[PDB]
Design a protein around this ligand. Structure first.
Ligand SMILES: OC[C@H]1O[C@@H](O[C@H]2[C@H](O)[C@@H](O)[C@H](O[C@H]3[C@H](O)[C@@H](O)[C@H](O[C@H]4[C@H](O)[C@@H](O)[C@H](O)O[C@@H]4CO)O[C@@H]3CO)O[C@@H]2CO)[C@H](O)[C@@H](O)[C@@H]1O
Length: 330
């Protein structure tokens, strides 16, 4: 594993030729060098490990992302792929995504893509299995190697915290705050410009517990994954109550949203919807200044943003998020 990893090279500086502007948090906003507010709207790729196995791992794929108007790309590093490639093999993919995004002008979010209760080591399935030690070691290596590369602006500590109603144990917000604080200290000690993205429970949906007892670190923003079936009923009023109101105080980065019909490929709760969710959520996010990232720019993982690699034809949700990214990104 990670505890074996022998002499990993440093990032190859010759792979990039420009420095994107520095992003930072100021009160509830992301701002640039000049103090201008920046709202990010982007896509998740699938795991670089899958893209490479698909024989699609080249700059071309990221150039398509750029033509869809995205100004950020989230990279979901699965602990299973990190173990299968090994640290050295995996960093060879990850350095290429970082370099490509950098040359295309696109910011990167590094996402440690597990689901469940890290404190008790119970995960939604083995694809996500890790440990506190492996997670800290990952944050330590990536914050060390990408230090000073401004496009690597966001470090998303742990994709979706959930206890699944006790099926995955017990972990209070207080205990999850302390774990995020240690990860943030590691990351900031390697990379002082790093912005950490922190999530709460119900699969990174809730921010009420965070609001009542916020992470004690600076330059932090908060995550929500408000998929179509997280709540029904009056949608906006429910979203505002569960996580949206947080955006009046800290920036909120909604690092997954997506939807597809009951009959679409891989359709599953909570992503099923007639289609009215797309306009409704990007309007609501515009009303709150909330950044977001659609899931997933891949033709297999569900819900898909496009139908196949031959054409990159957008699906229903792809068409809508592409139109809004082209139109609203500044
Ligand atoms: O990771 C590769 C794999 O990913 C799938 O996409 C996932 C993302 O990895 C993940 O971040 C996220 O997870 C889902 C989660 O899998 C669901 O089990 C969970 O469902 C909850 C729901 O949120 C509750 O409100 C309801 O009460 O309970 C159910 C469980 O009973 O919801 C979260 C999201 O909230 O996002 C993606 C789902 O699109 C790919 O789709 C898959 O094809 C790939 O292997």
């Amino acid at each position: 594993g990670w505890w074996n990893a022998s002499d990993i090279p440093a990032f190859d500086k010759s792979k990039i030729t420009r420095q994107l502007p520095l992003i930072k948090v100021e009160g509830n906003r992301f701002v640039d060098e000049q103090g201008k507010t920046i709202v990010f709207r982007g896509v998740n790729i699938s795991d670089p490990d899958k893209i490479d196995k698909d024989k699609r791992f080249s700059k071309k794929h990221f150039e398509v992302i750029r033509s869809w108007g995205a100004n950020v790309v989230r990279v979901p590093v699965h602990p299973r792929a990190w173990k299968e490639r090994g640290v050295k093999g995996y960093l060879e993919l990850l350095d290429q995504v970082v370099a490509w995004n950098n040359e295309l002008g696109i910011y990167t979010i590094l996402d440690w893509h597990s689901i469940g209760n890290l404190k008790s080591e119970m995960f939604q399935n083995n694809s996500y299995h890790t440990t506190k030690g492996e997670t800290f070691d990952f944050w330590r290596r990536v914050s060390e190697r990408y230090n000073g590369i401004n496009s690597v602006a966001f470090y998303e500590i742990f994709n979706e915290p959930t206890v699944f109603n006790g099926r995955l144990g017990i972990a209070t917000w207080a205990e999850w705050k302390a774990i995020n604080e240690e990860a943030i200290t590691i990351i900031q000690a390697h990379n002082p410009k790093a912005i950490a993205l922190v999530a709460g429970f119900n699969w990174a949906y809730d921010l009420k517990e965070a609001a009542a007892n916020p992470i004690d670190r600076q330059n932090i923003a908060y995550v929500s994954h408000p998929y179509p079936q997280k709540v029904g009923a009056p949608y906006q009023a429910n979203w505002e109550r569960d996580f949206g109101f947080m955006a009046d105080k800290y920036p909120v980065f909604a690092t997954e949203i997506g939807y597809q019909r009951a009959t679409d490929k891989g359709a599953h709760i909570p992503v099923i919807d007639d289609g009215s969710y797309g306009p409704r959520i990007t309007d609501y996010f515009n009303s709150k200044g909330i950044s977001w990232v659609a899931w997933v720019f891949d033709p297999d993982w569900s819900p898909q943003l496009f139908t196949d690699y031959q054409t990159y034809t957008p699906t229903m949700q792809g068409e809508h998020f592409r139109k809004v990214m082209l139109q609203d990104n500044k």
